[PDB]
């Protein structure tokens, strides 16, 4: 079979604003079966009062509330037109927002079910002023959180201390069962002469409780391959260490592209291939 867990649309105010048919139609010619449109839900807007560093990471983060029926409308017509070639499910890349659990609660309890997929992505960090962006540029990242937890291994771990929560939080029914990208606090590894060949034992550690639980629940993993194509990253989320932990603990994993337009569909797909074996 050929899936794609993680994909974005023209309602992601951040991405190439391709038009999701065109997006559709290049993951038939490269022959997926299945294909989940899961666009960035829209912020808490209390969560937004609290946030620092560049204002862009929070503005640009997600469509606003109102575009939700506009959301549901284009994706459900999208679906039954590629029916007889493709499988689309629609959800959302749900953010994890550390103390807002009651806000993303009522979210999904809300439009759960209108949904048939998801993914939990932890995005941002409690950093310098605020919250901070985990994933916006080397420099934020460098500014809002690797200074303020003391150094890159710093902010990994607390990095995973947040991945951690979002696994063992109550979300209700309509929670996510696949956890996103989990090894984001690398995209900008490169900008501090860092790479995955030298997690330390206490990272390593992180990681293996995290897997635990993950199994314990029941939960998958997106094997994001966006990561590949990040000029200071160069890696996959998660890295093939984790991915043999995980694979050893049976948790399943699902590709996922990322794909903000047409030219990321199916990138790394053969690299997904090859990890899990
Ligand atoms: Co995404
Ligand atoms: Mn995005
Ligand atoms: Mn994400």
Same mark, same amino acid.
């Given at each position: 079979?050929?899936?794609?867990?993680?994909?974005?649309?023209?309602?992601?105010?951040?991405?190439?604003?391709?038009?999701?048919?065109?997006?559709?139609?290049?993951? %038939?010619?490269?022959?997926?079966?299945?294909?989940? %449109?899961?666009?960035?839900?829209?912020?808490?807007?209390? $969560?937004?009062?609290?946030? &620092?560093?560049? *204002?862009?990471? #929070?503005?640009? &983060?997600?469509?606003?509330?109102?575009?939700? +029926?506009?959301?549901?409308?284009?994706?459900?017509? @999208? *679906?039954?037109?590629?029916?007889?070639?493709?499988? %689309?499910? @629609?959800?959302?890349?749900?953010?994890?927002?550390?103390?807002?659990?009651?806000?993303?609660?009522?979210?999904?309890?809300?439009?759960? +079910?209108?949904?048939?997929?998801?993914?939990?992505?932890?995005?941002?960090?409690?950093?310098?002023?605020?919250?901070?962006?985990?994933? !916006?540029?080397?420099?934020?990242?460098?500014?809002? @959180?690797?200074? =303020?937890?003391?150094? =890159?291994?710093?902010?990994?771990?607390?990095?995973?201390?947040?991945?951690?929560?979002?696994?063992?939080?109550?979300?209700?029914?309509?929670?996510?069962?696949?956890?996103?990208?989990?090894?984001?606090?690398?995209?900008?590894?490169? /900008? !501090?002469?860092?790479?995955?060949?030298? /997690?330390?034992?206490?990272?390593?550690?992180?990681?293996?409780? %995290?897997?635990?639980?993950?199994?314990?629940?029941?939960?998958?993993?997106? $094997?994001?391959?966006?990561?590949? /194509? *990040?000029?200071?990253?160069?890696?996959?989320? +998660?890295?093939?260490?984790?991915?043999?932990? &995980?694979?050893?603990?049976?948790? +399943? =994993? #699902?590709?996922?592209?990322?794909?903000?337009?047409?030219?990321?569909?199916?990138?790394?797909?053969?690299?997904?291939?090859? *990890?899990?074996?």
């Amino acid at each position: 079979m050929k899936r794609d867990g993680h994909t974005h649309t023209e309602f992601c105010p951040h991405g190439t604003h391709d038009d999701v048919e065109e997006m559709v139609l290049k993951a %038939i010619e490269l022959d997926f079966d299945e294909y989940s %449109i899961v666009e960035h839900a829209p912020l808490s807007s209390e $969560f937004m009062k609290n946030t &620092a560093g560049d *204002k862009e990471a #929070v503005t640009t &983060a997600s469509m606003a509330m109102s575009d939700l +029926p506009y959301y549901f409308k284009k994706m459900n017509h @999208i *679906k039954k037109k590629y029916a007889s070639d493709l499988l %689309i499910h @629609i959800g959302f890349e749900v953010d994890y927002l550390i103390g807002y659990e009651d806000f993303t609660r009522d979210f999904l309890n809300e439009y759960g +079910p209108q949904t048939d997929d998801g993914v939990l992505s932890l995005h941002f960090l409690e950093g310098q002023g605020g919250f901070r962006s985990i994933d !916006f540029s080397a420099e934020d990242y460098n500014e809002g @959180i690797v200074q =303020f937890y003391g150094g =890159f291994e710093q902010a990994q771990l607390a990095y995973l201390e947040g991945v951690k929560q979002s696994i063992e939080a109550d979300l209700g029914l309509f929670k996510p069962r696949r956890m996103g990208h989990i090894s984001l606090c690398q995209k900008f590894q490169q /900008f !501090f002469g860092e790479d995955t060949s030298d /997690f330390s034992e206490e990272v390593m550690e992180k990681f293996r409780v %995290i897997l635990a639980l993950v199994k314990k629940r029941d939960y998958e993993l997106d $094997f994001n391959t966006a990561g590949l /194509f *990040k000029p200071l990253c160069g890696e996959t989320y +998660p890295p093939k260490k984790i991915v043999t932990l &995980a694979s050893e603990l049976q948790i +399943p =994993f #699902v590709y996922g592209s990322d794909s903000h337009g047409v030219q990321d569909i199916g990138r790394g797909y053969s690299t997904y291939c090859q *990890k899990l074996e």
